[PDB]
Symmetry: C3
């Protein structure tokens, strides 16, 4: 079909489904309560991402916010997916370092302004302001990364970079490739980090 | 007024209000903490449903997604209501069988993709895809019903059936009756199951 | 710029940022888990409010729902902000009076219908119904204030008053001043109550 990045969306869908299937199959037997918590969180993330990728694939989680004299396609379902998977991720990270609820709520709270503000950046029609939201979102990311303190850092910090050179940002790489880099980013975070 | 199913919406509003009133009155005296938790959850569900039904009654939680060559009315407030009442319900079911947070989060997590995906099915303009979302939502329902394991099963499984023959699905029964069957479904789940 | 209340939005942004900065700086050193919980909640509220005020300032969290023969500007980001800050607030109040989860969920549950219904009132195009939602929202406020039982009462009860004489309600004071009174209201609740 006519949308260059459909194949990256299609690859994304496939890899998220499969990994869900995989963590689902792998969850059985888990009776240890704690272990069940880890498993449920690890299974749910790609599940969610699977439905989000399918919606973008299907062209539903996509919309054309105008800016820079341009009518631009924006996959708002990306943010929809990060809104729910990133705090769960942190839930997992919180069990590792065994973080208090105090730490947890600020971590999860900083996380929501993060994706909430990038989605606002995503959807603003006044190009100049997009980066203000981008910087406020990036500033919340560093809070999280900072309380969270080696691969989450590099993995999470790459989203703001691809956004910035992305076609939602400076516009340095076409959408077809920005989509590509997010997919690779989402699969490693949703599936590999869960595998790892 | 001109919308055939307004009376089913009106009946729905009335029954949700009344039952709220009822569980509200019945909650007083509850000092036992656990009991308070059961009461709060049972009171809140119809409360929410009361406001959702009123909005659809008032014609506000309604919208006309086009598909099948048709401009179709879709009560998106139904999903808005299920998004919040169904996990609370499960909260209650979780206390019965005393389910771990592990079990609880997957149960509540499976539940959100469930209504999230049906709402997407609800709102897609490409008729063919509606059922793909319908099946992904139904597949999450069975996870829940399956971890949840005799009346929740029959009650919950009826939503996907009415959706399917519903005017949001195959279109086998007109909207005026699909609304009817959901109301009967929602009241028994929101009020009777709470009573029961 | 051309929107009379921009300065109240600008003042609002500034005061929310500063107080965030302030509670952020003040949070450091906190190792006591409980104390961390109080600090995280107190820091997060103005953070959120800071981004909401900026969006309204930037004219993004604003929209023009028509009613009374009029095309009216409605700052939906106000509700977006209350949706998340008010339950956190109550989280704090819950720690003071040390409220059970039972009490907590009804408190937080009543709170969501509250802002959810006012936003519906905010957005209905049939002027008459706006107040029905207003009264249902106000009725949920009194539940909260009532379980919550001296300044939260007066502070929280003022939102429904300014709404009512506000330009989203009876229209007794122009928007430029309704915005003013909410800002003063939000800063004292978001920052002063946190300071206090
Ligand atoms: C706590 C602790 C911390 C709180 C964090 C604060 C977050 C700030 C978010 C604010 C901004 C939200 C914007 C969104 C509500 C509306 C954006 O739509 C724009 C006009 O509103 C236009 O694009 C609209 C066209 C399209 C819109 C895409 C919407 C997307 C929604 C993704 C959510 C999904 C779940 C929906 C319910 C199921
Ligand atoms: C923090 C401090 C920096 C705030 C000042 C900024 C620059 C203000 O200059 C004005 C234009 O002459 C913008 O006002 C307003 C006109 C425009 C509105 C933009 C206001 C924002 C720039 C205010 C700060 C939001 C951004 C900050 C980036 C996140 C940071 C707080 C981590
Ligand atoms: C997508 C690109 C192709 C990938 C390019 C990224 C290179 C990956 C860096 C390798 C990693 C190194 C971490 C190894 C660990 C060793 C730990 O050393 C320290 C012991 O005192 C603990 O963390 C010590 C801290 C050290 C590393 C901690 C986190 C890192 C910080 C990286 C920031 C991120 C930036 C995102 C890059 C974006 C442009 C892709
Ligand atoms: C704490 C601090 C306040 C951090 C806040 C950052 C504030 C953002 C300031 C950047 C803003 C002034 C840039 C305005 C874009 C400007 C080029 C407008 C574009 O002009 C043309 C309009 O027909 C379109 O060209 C299209 C131009 C595009 C090819 C590229 C647009 C510019 C880009 C800006 C990205 C800046 C990043 C480094 C993020 C800033 C940090
Ligand atoms: C966790 C764990 C699990 C996560 C589950 C994933 C859920 C997947 C949801 C995704 C799809 C969400 C769609 C919704 C955000 C936007 C749909 O609108 C469509 C374009 O976006 C068009 O119809 C728009 C016209 C009308 C739109 C109706 C919107 C409805 C919103 C109901 C939510 C209510 C609460 C709103 C905030 C108060
Ligand atoms: C699970 C496995 C089944 C996935 C394959 C499907 C059929 C794929 O055929 C292609 C059309 O020739 C659809 O690709 C894509 C074109 C269309 C997009 C639809 C993709 C979805 C069919 C992929 C699976 C989503 C549905 C699955 C129903 C839920 C199930 C996973 C419980
Ligand atoms: C809306 C229609 C008019 C209503 C038609 C539905 C008929 C209701 C079925 C009667 C119920 C029977 C359950 C009795 C209990 C006894 C338990 O037996 C087992 C002991 O080993 C435990 O559960 C044993 C499992 C057994 C039943 C468990 C759940 C049931 C499964 C039903 C699936 C649902 C399908 C929804 C039907 C839809 C078309 C309305
Ligand atoms: C539990 C326990 C208790 C549950 C409480 C029930 C709450 C009832 C809420 C219901 C009403 C929700 C309305 C909203 C989803 C959609 C309103 O938009 C209208 C048509 O839908 C038109 O204005 C649309 C133009 C603009 C719309 C502004 C939307 C605002 C959204 C604010 C949410 C933010 C977060 C978004 C995801 C990030
Ligand atoms: C509670 C009880 C009061 C409900 C009756 C109301 C008045 C009904 O009169 C009808 C117009 O002749 C409205 O029906 C429907 C036509 C219009 C729809 C409005 C229905 C609402 C008025 C029903 C009650 C919602 C409001 C109640 C305010 C909150 C209260 C329950 C705390
Ligand atoms: C914005 C306007 C300029 C401000 C005008 C509001 C005046 C402020 C009232 C002063 C306060 C008094 C509370 C003092 C405390 C003393 C406690 O006395 C009782 C001991 O039995 C405990 O609470 C006893 C209860 C007593 C007070 C409890 C809560 C109060 C109730 C006020 C309702 C609110 C209405 C909002 C007013 C709106 C129009 C601004
Ligand atoms: C438990 C109870 C059921 C509580 C529920 C409250 C139900 C609300 C009933 C109020 C409703 C009948 C008022 C209808 C407004 C009416 C003036 C319509 C306006 O007429 C003109 C139309 O061209 C516009 O004038 C513009 C008129 C505006 C200048 C003012 C509009 C009227 C205001 C109504 C506010 C009433 C408050 C006291 C809240 C009610 C409690
Ligand atoms: C991995 C095992 C043991 C079970 C199978 C899991 C099911 C899903 C298969 C896809 C998993 C993803 C690979 C993990 C690592 C990442 C960095 C993700 C890279 C994604 C891009 C695809 C490139 C192809 C691959 C060699 C995986
Ligand atoms: C029931 C008691 C003890 C208190 C009163 C509760 C307040 C609400 C009244 C409505 C309650 C609903 C009935 C419970 C059972 C269900 C299967 C729901 C069926 C709904 C349809 C209406 C048909 C009429 C009735 C005979 C209730
Ligand atoms: C207050 C201390 C110790 C630290 C500084 C906090 C950072 C933010 C500064 C603004 C704080 C707000 C004042 C608290 C009280 C309120 C009732 C809010 C009133 C808001 C309106 C502005 C009027 C100016 C002021 C005198 C604050
Ligand atoms: C899917 C799994 C993870 C960990 C996804 C993480 C996403 C982010 C950290 C995205 C961050 C953004 C920032 C910091 C700034 C621009 C907007 C984004 C939401 C892309
Ligand atoms: C209101 C109380 C309950 C238990 C409501 C339950 C609703 C569902 C189980 C709805 C399920 C759907 C599915 C499985 C598929 C189509 C979309 C629906 C959301 C209608
Ligand atoms: C920002 C901090 C707090 C405590 C904000 C509180 C807001 C309210 C209590 C708002 C209440 C409303 C009601 C009761 C009726 C009309 C709609 C409103 C949401 C404005």
């Amino acid at each position: 079909t006519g949308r260059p990045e459909w194949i990256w969306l299609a690859l994304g869908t496939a890899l998220m489904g499969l990994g869900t299937l995989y963590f689902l199959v792998k969850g059985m037997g888990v009776s240890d309560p704690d272990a069940k918590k880890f498993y449920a969180i690890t299974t749910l993330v790609p599940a969610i991402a699977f439905t989000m990728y399918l919606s973008m694939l299907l062209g539903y989680g996509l919309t054309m916010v105008p800016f820079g004299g341009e009518q631009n396609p924006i996959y708002w379902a990306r943010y929809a997916d990060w809104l729910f998977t990133t705090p769960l991720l942190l839930l997992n990270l919180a069990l590792l370092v065994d973080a208090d609820q105090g730490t947890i709520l600020a971590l999860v709270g900083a996380d929501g302004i993060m994706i909430g503000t990038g989605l606002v950046g995503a959807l603003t029609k006044v190009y100049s302001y997009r980066f203000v939201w981008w910087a406020i979102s990036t500033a919340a990311m560093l809070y999280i990364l900072y309380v969270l303190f080696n691969v989450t850092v590099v993995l999470w910090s790459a989203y703001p970079v691809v956004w910035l050179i992305g076609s939602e940002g400076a516009g340095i790489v076409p959408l077809n490739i920005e989509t590509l880099l997010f997919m690779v980013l989402d699969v490693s975070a949703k599936v590999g980090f869960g595998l790892i």
